């Protein structure tokens, strides 16, 4: 038992919008001065500058409008069935997306016959020059070449099919620019190109509609054109469909064809088969019903109000993640699929609705990982490949890097990575010395940060461990990723000295970095904990000995002493050595999470706790904002009250009307690494794994009553309840695992 989001009065602007999606599609939906407005974003729609374009904005007006000064207004997110419902006296509108097909549906049911106008609004009707600061939404960031523009869409007026909109990419894209910049033209002809000719759009369609002409205005400081359709005859029912298609094609004909094929499915002889759309609808709702059975964290005086808040928000976010199961590319951290008009976020950055900070086809690994990690314990295993394929798609490209720059095998996956496997052109350096290594970013924050891929590698393996997933398509990726660290730091040492290993026969991890925070490291704890834990884990799943050899070559995690404001405390060191500090991450707790070397029910917990409580960089960097993992670590170290405080802070209502729209923090709104991280935190307070143990309530307060169900390794599922400090229930499946449970509530 939980709660939907119910607004009983209309919304003022696009920031006061509601998420709704499914499949690879996300809509922001709201009602403003009697109009039903929805933005429509789909995963993977990257322009020639690698900006994530929204497909458009949709407007629905009824006449006489029952939403004008309406009594009994109600916009409701109907979680269980994954659809939004807007209703007022004798009218009921439903919006949903098919989970199994790229199609949005609007349904109107009126007691009396009403008239309906539907408008398709597109602000890319003509070329628009990228203004100062607008580059952040693309790969050029702060330095878009003079005369760089967002190219125009192709709208046109030709069954029930009415309107055709699409954007098409040219042959020349930021890919070709970046290939040149980083000197890989030699091997360009062997590289996957995600952007060349990439085309994406669809049909607006309905029965009982005529065209009512074009019209021009401004929505949120953004000029736009609108095409309008009006129903020939008033009617008790009205049904509109939007049908999308995405593809790289030699001609526009080829693309159109694929769109037609998708359109025919739902309109076999030109009309929208309400038989077919009923199956689609039924399927979709079952899927959502199943969705809310995979996992949950629910409740059962303002203490309870606050718990309800975070559990509610935890859930609302999970909905948002759900909207992009089966995306070809992952839910992005910086807005996801639910960006709105920038001006509501920052007036200095008031650009098109296609705008967000930190790029579109450009995705920072450290953020992306926080979106996905929580999908293991929530059982959302089928969504995670969206994230895995992103990297698998560019494995050949990331390898050709290492071939070109250092003539060795293995994939070089930079931190701020494009969808084509090279680092972001801007961060690589536009004004860089001729002599500098072509494989290295001319960058103080990013140089030698290649280790986040290993977190995704761990995710892949953990899908096997948690859900028996078939991960055969990924093994090459995992192997190539490890091969790099071995072949790189061997070669670097052999070029510098006579020995390629240290005197303990271990790898010499220099130059490295501990995330983006400690730079030019020797033997960072973060990178080590990773190689150790990935290899340990990949050994259990591969008899080959090359991997046990390499595990023996991994140096130990470095520790150190710190004085306390005497007495000395022993903590985890950032690294054996570093040159400087350029950020506010805390990679000396990466052995706590993600790699779970230290943690509850594991050795030397006192070391980790002291790192959390006394490392003065960690103290200084502690926070609940954005990606800050202090909430996670607190929980993994069994510090309730600390975890309680942070998780309260992290998951409490965001600044917009929908309460799980958090941001912008260090990123963009809706911040998804905010949600993601926050999920992780709540999850770890309840359930942790320690070998084959399942530790329940490791960092959960007695006075928080809870009913949850989370996953654990070996297709295991734990449903439990705490009430007035008693574990009143336990339902465990398979039952053989019930004896592995350890209750920790004291």
Residue numbers in the entry: 21 to 178, 184 to 325, 346 to 610, 622 to 802
Authors' description from the paper:
To date, family GH139 is the only family known to be able to degrade α1,2-linked MeFuc, making it essential for RG-II metabolism and a feature of RG-II-degrading bacteria. In this report, we present the 3D structure of BT0984GH139, alongside its homolog SDT91673.1GH139 from Verrucomicrobium sp. GAS474, an organism isolated from forest soil. Crystals of BT0984GH139 formed in space group P212121 and diffracted to a resolution of 2.7 Å, while crystals of SDT91673.1GH139 formed in space group P 6522 and diffracted to 2.05 Å, providing good quality electron density maps in both cases. Both proteins adopt a three-domain architecture, consisting of an N-terminal β-sheet domain leading into an α-helical domain composed of a core (α/α)6 toroid structure. GH139 enzymes operate via an inverting mechanism in which we propose that N412 functions as the catalytic base and E561 acts as the catalytic acid (BT0984GH139 numbering).
The B. theta protein BT0984 was the founding member of GH139 (BT0984GH139) and is specific for the α1,2-linked MeFuc in chain B(6). BT0984GH139 specifically cleaves α1,2 linked MeFuc in partially digested RG-II but cannot access this residue within the intact polysaccharide. However, once the preceding arabinofuranose (Araf) and rhamnose (Rha) residues have been removed, BT0984GH139 can efficiently remove MeFuc from isolated chain B. BT0984GH139 exhibited no activity on 4-nitrophenyl α-L-fucoside (4NP-Fuc) but displayed activity on 4-nitrophenyl 2-O-methyl-α-L-fucoside (4NP-MeFuc). By 3 h the anomeric signals had reached equilibrium. These data indicate BT0984GH139 produces β-MeFuc and performs cleavage with inversion of the anomeric configuration of the α-MeFuc linkage. In BT0984GH139, a triad of Trp residues, W162, W403, and W490, lines the putative positively numbered subsites, providing aromatic stacking interactions for sugars within the Δbt0984 oligo. D723 forms hydrogen bonds with both N412 and N729, at distances of 3.3 Å and 2.9 Å, respectively, suggesting it may fulfill the role of activating N412 to function as a catalytic base. In BT0984GH139, the amide side chain of Q411 is positioned 3.5 Å from the catalytic acid E561, and could fulfill the same role as N421 in AfcAGH95 upon substrate binding. Surprisingly, overnight endpoint assays revealed that only one mutation in BT0984GH139, E561A, completely inactivated the enzyme. Based on these data, and with comparison to GH95, it appears that N412 and E561 function as the catalytic base and acid, respectively, in an inverting catalytic mechanism.
